Write a protein that binds this ligand. Structure first.
Ligand code: AG0
Length: 562
C-alpha cells in the first residue's frame, strides 16, 4: 500500500521560519561562513513528501518467522504497568504542543481540571472504541545543517506526525513502561539505547575483538518510517501483548495500534485534511521502540538469509550496524548484496548500499565512530566521536537565536572527551554564559530523544560520572580525527586551535576568579588549555551522581521529559 496519500492541501507553518543563519557578532566569532549554515522550513515539505511517498511490497520467509518467535519468547518474560494520569502528566515536556481541547502542557504538568478531565475522556474512548482513526497533525521540522557541496543539494525538511496532547498522555499511561523495558529484554546487548557513549564504545570494541577477521557495515534504510507496513505495526503490537499487562493496558494498546499506530488522517496547522498515513508515525511514543524492534527483526532475519558468519547487531531505531566474520573481500561484497536483497524483500530497501569496512574507526553508526586518544598516563584509550559539522552549525544557530531545545549542551555531555567539544563548544558557551551571567540557569537538552533540564555548572561532575576523569585529560588524538576537525574548521570558517586556547585560558581565569562551582568548571573543563596542568582529582559530587536513567531507552518523537 502507499505510505501516504495526499489531498493537495499544503503542509503549513504556524509561525515565521528562518532559513539563513543571521549575521550576529557572537555566532560570527564561532564560525564566519554563515552562508554555509541553513535551516529546513515548510518551503521544502513538498520535496520530502515526494521522497517518503511510495508503495511498499513485503514478503515474509522462515528466517523472519523464526526470529519473530524468539523475540516473542523474550517479550513474554516482561511485566509492565500502567502509569497513573499524574505520573504521565509529569512526563510531559513544558513546551509540548498544546491540546486543541483548550489546555496546554503547563496545564497538564499542573494537573489542571480541564486537562486531567479531558485525558480521562480520551482514555475512556480508547477503551470503548478500537476502530475509529485518531487525528494527527503534520508539520515540517525546522532543523539546522551545513551545506554539503559534494552531495549536490540541500536537505528538505523532515515531517513530524503527532496526535493531540491528550492522546500523548494516554500513550504514556499504556506504553511508557513497555517501551522503557521491553527492547532490552528482547534484543539484549544489541539494544543501543541502554549504553552511554563510553559503553557503546566498549560494546563495539569488544564485539570487533571477538571476531578473527572482523568486518562491519552500517545499513542505511531508505526513509525507514515510510517502509514500516501495517504488518510490521501489528507485529510490534503482538510483541507488546506478550508482556504481562493489566487488562486495561492490553485494550488501550490494541486500540492505539488500530486507531493511531497503523495509520490515520493527517491535518495541517490550519485544520485542513492533507491526506492519510499507512506507515510509521514519527511523533508517537512507540516510534523509537517500534523502529528498533522492526529493524532488529528484519536485519536479524536478513543476516540468516545472507549466511553472514557470527553477525552481531547494534540497533538504535532505524540505525543499524552489523559486525561479523569476513569471508574475504569478494565474498563479503556478495554477502552484503544478499543481505540487502533480503532487507528489500522485507520492506527495508537501502539508501546508500552497505559497504564492508575492515577498520572499526571508519564505521559510522548513530552518526558517530570509535576513535583513539591517550589519557594522562599515556595509555591508548577508546572514545566516541563524530564529524563536528552539524554540532558546530547548530551551536552557531543557537548562539544567534533562542531555541526550545539546545543541542550544544547535549553535545557537550555526550561528546565531552572529544577534542572539538572541549576546544570549541565548552570554550564558546562558557564565554557566552560568563558574559550574560547565566552560568546558574538550567537549560533544556535532549539525550536519546528525552528532554532533561541541566545546569551548566554541574557539567564537571556529569562528565566525570559519564566518561571518567580522563575526559579532562585526553590528548594525542588520532591524525584522522585531527584532520577531520581541521577540515571542518576550514569549511565553516571556525578559528584555529591557537585562538580557542587563548579564549579558553581567559574563560578559565574568569571562572576560577568567581569561586564556587564556576571555579570547578574552570579547573576541570579547561585544564587542557594551560601550560601548567593542575592535578585533577575525583569530584565529590560525582560519586553521589545517578545518571543511569539517562541511558535506558530511546524516546525520539515520544514527547518525554525526565
Ligand atoms: C584541529 C585542531 C587541533 C587540535 C589538536 C588537539 C589539541 C589538544 C586538545 C584540544 C581540546 C582538548 C585537548 C590540546 C593540547 O594542548 C594537546 C597536547 C597535550 N595535552 C596533553 N595533556 C597531557 C596530560 C599529556 C600530554 C602529552 N599532552 N599533550 C592535545 O593533545 O590536544 C591538535 C592539533 C594538531 C596540533 N590540531
Amino acid at each position: 500500500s502507499m505510505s501516504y496519500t495526499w489531498t493537495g492541501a499544503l503542509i503549513t507553518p504556524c509561525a515565521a521560519e528562518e532559513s539563513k543563519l543571521p549575521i550576529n557578532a557572537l555566532s560570527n566569532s564561532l564560525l564566519r561562513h554563515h552562508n554555509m549554515v541553513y535551516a529546513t522550513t515548510s518551503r521544502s515539505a513538498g520535496q520530502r513528501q515526494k521522497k517518503v511517498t511510495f508503495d511498499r511490497l513485503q514478503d515474509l520467509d522462515d528466517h523472519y518467522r523464526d526470529v519473530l518467535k524468539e523475540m516473542k519468547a523474550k517479550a513474554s518474560t516482561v511485566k509492565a504497568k500502567l502509569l497513573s494520569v499524574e505520573e504521565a502528566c509529569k512526563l510531559t515536556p513544558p513546551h509540548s504542543a498544546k491540546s486543541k481541547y483548550g489546555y496546554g502542557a503547563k496545564d497538564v504538568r499542573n494537573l489542571s481540571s480541564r486537562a486531567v478531565n479531558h485525558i480521562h475522556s480520551v482514555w475512556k474512548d480508547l477503551l470503548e472504541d478500537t476502530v475509529t482513526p485518531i487525528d494527527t497533525t503534520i508539520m515540517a521540522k525546522n532543523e539546522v545543517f551545513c551545506v554539503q557541496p559534494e552531495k549536490g543539494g540541500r536537505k528538505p525538511a523532515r515531517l513530524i506526525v503527532f496526535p493531540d496532547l491528550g492522546v500523548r498522555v494516554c500513550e504514556k499511561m499504556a506504553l511508557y513502561d513497555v517501551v522503557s523495558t521491553l527492547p532490552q529484554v528482547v534484543m539484549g546487548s544489541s539494544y543501543g539505547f541502554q549504553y552511554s557513549p563510553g559503553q557503546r564504545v566498549e560494546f563495539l570494541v569488544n564485539t570487533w575483538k571477538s571476531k578473527k577477521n572482523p568486518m562491519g557495515f552500517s545499513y542505511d534504510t531508505r526513509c525507514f518510517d515510510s517502509t514500516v507496513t501495517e504488518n510490521d505495526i501489528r507485529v510490534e503490537e503482538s510483541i507488546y501483548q506478550c508482556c504481562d499487562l493489566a487488562p486495561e493496558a492490553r485494550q488501550a494498546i490494541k486500540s492505539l495500534t488500530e486507531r493511531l499506530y497503523i495509520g490515520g488522517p493527517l491535518t495541517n496547522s490550519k485544520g485542513q485534511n492533507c491526506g492519510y498515513r499507512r506507515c510509521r508515525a514519527s511523533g508517537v511514543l512507540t516510534t523509537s521502540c517500534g523502529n528498533t524492534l522492526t529493524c532488529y527483526l528484519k536485519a536479524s532475519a536478513a543476516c540468516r538469509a545472507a549466511k553472514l558468519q557470527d553477525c552481531t547487531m547494534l540497533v538504535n531505531g532505524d540505525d543499524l550496524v552489523v559486525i561479523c566474520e569476513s569471508a574475504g573481500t569478494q565474498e563479503d561484497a556478495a554477502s552484503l548484496r544478499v543481505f540487502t536483497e533480503a532487507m528489500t524483500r522485507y520492506s527495508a530497501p537501502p539508501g546508500d548500499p552497505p559497504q564492508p569496512e575492515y577498520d572499526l574507526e571508519l564505521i559510522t553508526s548513530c552518526s558517530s565512530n570509535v576513535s583513539v586518544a591517550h589519557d594522562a598516563s599515556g595509555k591508548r584509550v577508546y572514545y566516541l566521536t563524530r564529524d563536528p559539522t552539524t554540532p558546530l552549525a547548530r551551536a552557531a544557530w543557537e548562539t544567534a537565536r533562542h531555541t526550545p531545545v539546545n543541542s550544544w549542551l547535549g553535545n557537550i555531555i555526550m561528546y565531552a572527551p572529544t577534542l572539538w567539544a572541549r576546544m570549541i563548544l565548552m570554550t564558546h558557551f562558557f564565554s557566552i554564559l560568563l558574559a550574560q551571567e547565566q552560568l546558574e540557569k538550567a537549560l533544556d537538552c535532549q539525550i536519546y530523544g528525552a528532554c532533561y533540564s541541566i545546569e551548566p555548572l554541574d557539567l564537571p561532575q556529569i562528565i566525570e560520572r559519564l566518561h571518567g576523569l580522563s575526559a579532562f585529560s585526553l590528548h594525542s588524538y588520532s591524525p584522522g580525527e585531527i584532520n577531520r576537525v581541521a577540515s571542518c574548521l576550514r569549511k565553516l570558517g571556525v578559528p584555529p586551535l591557537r585562538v580557542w586556547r587563548h579564549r579558553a585560558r581567559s574563560v578559565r581565569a574568569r571562572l576560577l576568579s568567581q569561586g564556587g562551582r564556576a571555579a570547578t568548571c574552570g579547573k576541570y573543563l579547561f585544564n587542557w588549555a594551560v601550560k601548567t596542568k593542575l592535578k585533577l582529582t575525583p569530584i565529590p559530587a560525582a560519586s553521589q551522581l545517578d545518571l543511569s536513567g539517562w541511558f535506558v531507552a530511546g524516546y525520539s518523537g515520544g514527547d518525554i521529559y525526565h
